[PDB]
From a paper:
Protein stability can be fine‐tuned by modifying different structural features such as hydrogen‐bond networks, salt bridges, hydrophobic cores, or disulfide bridges. Among these, stabilization by salt bridges is a major challenge in protein design and engineering since their stabilizing effects show a high dependence on the structural environment in the protein, and therefore are difficult to predict and model. In this work, we explore the effects on structure and stability of an introduced salt bridge cluster in the context of three different de novo TIM barrels. The results show that despite the similarities in protein fold, the salt bridge clusters differently influence the structural and stability properties of the de novo TIM barrel variants depending on the structural background where they are introduced.
The salt bridge variants exhibit similar thermostability in comparison with their parental designs but important differences in the conformational stability at 25°C can be observed such as a highly stabilizing effect for two of the proteins but a destabilizing effect to the third. Rosetta modeling of the salt bridge clusters results in a good prediction of the tendency on stability changes but not the geometries observed in the three‐dimensional structures.
Author numbering: 8 to 94, 99 to 184
Amino acid sequence: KQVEILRRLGAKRIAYRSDDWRDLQEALKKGADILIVDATDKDEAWKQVEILRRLGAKEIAYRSDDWRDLQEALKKGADILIVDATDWKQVEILRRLGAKRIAYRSDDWRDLQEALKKGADILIVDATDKDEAWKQVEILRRLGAKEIAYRSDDWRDLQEALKKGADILIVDA
């Protein structure tokens, strides 16, 4: 009962990531709040957005670093765009494309802070490739960030992120 236990830990918003839209749908059925489609490693990933929307998903995020790809995801119903902060004047362009919610992902909290200063809505800290990543949550909260997402597959690590002020937990399905 991953979702159920995440809820018990105190997770108010839970996102699920997967290369298989079938996995995102199962997470939707289990109560996930956000489904994350990854377009950086496959073709026409907006077709996953279309499927999941037809199957009732109401909150879809789309990870891409390609402008026409991000635009197609918005057109197909994606609610959150996730872009790379490691390379932001792109924020205003994403806005004008039509993005209502913009998330930035980076291994470096300094990049996440720059994105925040330029108008990003969500900052994503990645704990799958480094230790004690909740220290990034800590710093970002003290630097004014109010909406931080934390990607990890370790239970104690996810809990520590919540305790340090992460608002969204991203788990890999």
